[PDB]
Design a protein around this ligand. Structure first.
Ligand code: LFA
Ligand code: LFA
Ligand code: LFA
Ligand code: LFA
Ligand code: MG
Ligand code: MG
Lengths: 408, 408
């Protein structure tokens, strides 16, 4: 594993580009978290906001040091020159204002020289650093190139030979990192159609938010064809406004209130229940997109789910004791569905290695409950059939799952 | 990791000593399973029953080969001589009729020369190979030694220098492995008070069965002070008669029948329920003692437990619908106790990092249920208070466990 050099000089909603938050995470922190397993030490080149960037990275638990220079207007190339003494052999060079998906960086750090993209999806083809290739090597570079075989992603894997070509321009007034790439005749590595972009406008942030969240999505039929399409739009909107823990609480409160909502108008309680089901997938989407995933959150979220599922069925039963005997089976089967998956992962170390095709997971189950709650206003006879239906599909899935593991 | 040499020649309930089953596992297989991670290849020296031992080890998935000699009556030393060409450098030498605990072998394979025991617990001090030590070295050996500082465990870690001393006796009629140890002036390694014995009488088998099972035991107060003391005696008795899977089924059937037993005499159903709780710990004891532990068994056993716990509470409720609303909370909390532990292990990778002190785990819970079932015959008013009590301690433990993980 080598060293990585991140360049932050210019330009500057009042917040410096590396510290601008995209998808519930600041740009420079996202880069470091993804490069971390592949990198021994991080070298940041900062000028005006060096103190701000340094003060931010202190408790992040990363191995880093900031290299300062007070002359940012002489180009991105000079930022590279001043970092010469802090690197050895092979190293990584990336931009502080660029956003990268984990899929991109995995196919990046294995590359060499310039990382190129033959068909950029998320950036402006008009404004982009265009590259023409000859002999798998950079024959040209620029924003205005007429004939180009790929586009610069702002990611580079370089070596000690790059300083020799860089020192050649040391006496220039402005030293664009672009021109340096030409002289060195650098190898072109291809990573195409992945998620990468440069953040400039607050509009770019929103476009990136959607991109990261969309890329962040055991789903069932309802979850696939309905719930995920509603939740991703909500998540992308609140992605840097709300953190995964707050979303866990919100989805729990909505869910709990939906269970309480059966005191007045049960058919309404079912609608709110389905809406809580839609929301329940937001914290995961946010955590995945912000790289904020934590075992503690997954644990708590699952327990609150189990409590909401219960409170909803048990509150109906409190009002209608005739169905309370059937409620037992629905309630028990409801938890056992989750327990079968969870006991598996604890014991075998991995999730589920099976066929779906048997209803039903929480998403489908809740959806039917909503309908049966709607049929309630017509007739109270549909309640009993709800409890029995829930108990039927749950326990069946639980038994088949048990009967499946027996054979191995 | 080195090579291990197991000696099986003599002597011979009609079954050859290495194939004699002790603690639900044959002697030679137990040895190999324990040495396996520490050993590259196994070398077995067999004479009369070589085919039988070979035919047995075929599908065991071990790396081994059998070295044959037709002259077993010339002593254990000759068995060592004939294995000279199949080993290199350092190697392990052990007896095919000796039973060893995992605790013993872990402190054995790190040793050198003769493994000695200064205070043998499980063997006959009268009949044992006694060793007198001088300068951490074997100064004497024999069954009849008057002054001895330790006793031979039949386990050895040797090297190429041992054949030179062994070839010295090649022309002898009987070559006891004992005499060879003297000549080589072998280092004495001390492993004291561990579980090891030689199996000769069917009585030795039973004594070993108890020893292995006793050494094979998230227990609560009832489990510690009552249940484990009854279950270990049952397990030790049936240890090589019943396999862990059969015991899982038996404890499930008893449990299920205890739940059905509420149709007639609920106070009886509670007694059978407590007895099923006692039995529920047998499969684990057997699997641990027989080295037969499998993730599949643990999975199935836990699911059947959850079903028995439910069937018991739900069958009472079917007969008494007035308590069916309180039954919901008891049933839900009953499963959630297990779910909280299991979701933890899946998410965090390990078990429970806490304080006990809050009732209650399944063992305590079931015990109280038995009592409340006894109070039922007096008054049916105790039923309701059972369901409520179960729901009270369960959910409380579940909440405190949840509230505990929040802080980390
Ligand atoms: C209704 C789903 C949760 C929305 C949270 C909105 C938070 C806005 C904070 C400013
Ligand atoms: C008193 C009402 C009892 C309802 C029992 C429902 C059982 C469903 C079992 C499904 C098994 C697959
Ligand atoms: C009652 C606990 C289970 C006892 C099984 C006994 C099996 C004996 C087989 C011979
Ligand atoms: C109709 C009977 C309702 C009984 C509810 C019992 C709730 C116990 C909650 C314990 C929480 C700690
Ligand atoms: Mg969730
Ligand atoms: Mg068990």
């Amino acid at each position: 594993l080598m060293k990585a050099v991140i360049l932050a000089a210019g330009l500057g909603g009042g917040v410096p580009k590396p510290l601008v938050r995209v998808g519930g995470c600041e740009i420079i922190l996202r880069t470091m978290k993804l490069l971390s397993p592949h990198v021994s030490e991080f070298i940041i080149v900062a000028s005006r906001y060096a103190d701000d960037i340094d003060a931010f990275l202190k408790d992040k638990g990363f191995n880093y040091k900031i290299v300062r220079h007070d002359r940012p207007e002489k180009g991105n190339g000079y930022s590279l020159l001043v970092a010469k003494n802090h690197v050895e052999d092979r190293f990584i060079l990336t931009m502080g204002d660029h956003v990268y998906s984990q899929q991109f960086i995995e196919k990046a750090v294995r590359g060499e020289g310039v990382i190129a993209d033959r068909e950029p999806r998320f950036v402006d083809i008009g404004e982009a650093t265009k590259i023409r290739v000859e002999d798998g090597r950079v024959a040209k570079i620029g924003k205005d190139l007429r004939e180009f075989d790929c586009v610069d992603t702002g990611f580079f894997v370089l070596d000690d030979s790059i300083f020799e070509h860089a020192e050649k321009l040391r006496d220039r007034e402005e030293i664009p990192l672009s021109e340096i790439v030409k002289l060195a005749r650098l190898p072109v590595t291809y990573v195409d159609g992945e998620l990468w972009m440069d953040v400039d406008t607050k509009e770019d942030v929103r476009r990136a938010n959607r991109a990261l969240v969309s890329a962040a999505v055991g789903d069932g039929f309802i979850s696939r064809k309905i719930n995920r399409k509603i939740s991703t739009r909500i998540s992308a909107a609140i992605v840097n406004k709300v953190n995964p823990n707050q979303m866990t609480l919100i989805s729990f409160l909505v869910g709990a209130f939906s269970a309480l909502a059966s005191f007045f108008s049960i058919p309404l309680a079912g609608l709110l229940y389905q809406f809580s089901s839609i929301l329940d997938g937001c914290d995961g989407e946010i955590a995945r997109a912000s790289l904020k995933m934590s075992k503690k959150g997954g644990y708590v979220d699952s327990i609150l789910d189990r409590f909401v599922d219960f409170l909803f069925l048990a509150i109906i039963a409190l009002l209608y004791p005739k169905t309370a005997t059937v409620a037992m089976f629905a309630i028990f089967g409801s938890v056992m569905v989750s327990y079968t998956s969870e006991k598996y992962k604890a014991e075998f170390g991995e999730s589920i290695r099976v066929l779906n095709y048997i209803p039903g997971k929480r998403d489908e189950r809740i959806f039917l409950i909503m309908i049966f709650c709607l049929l309630s206003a017509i007739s109270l006879q549909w309640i009993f059939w709800m409890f029995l239906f829930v108990a039927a599909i749950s326990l069946t899935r639980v038994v088949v799952t048990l009967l499946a593991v027996l054979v191995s």
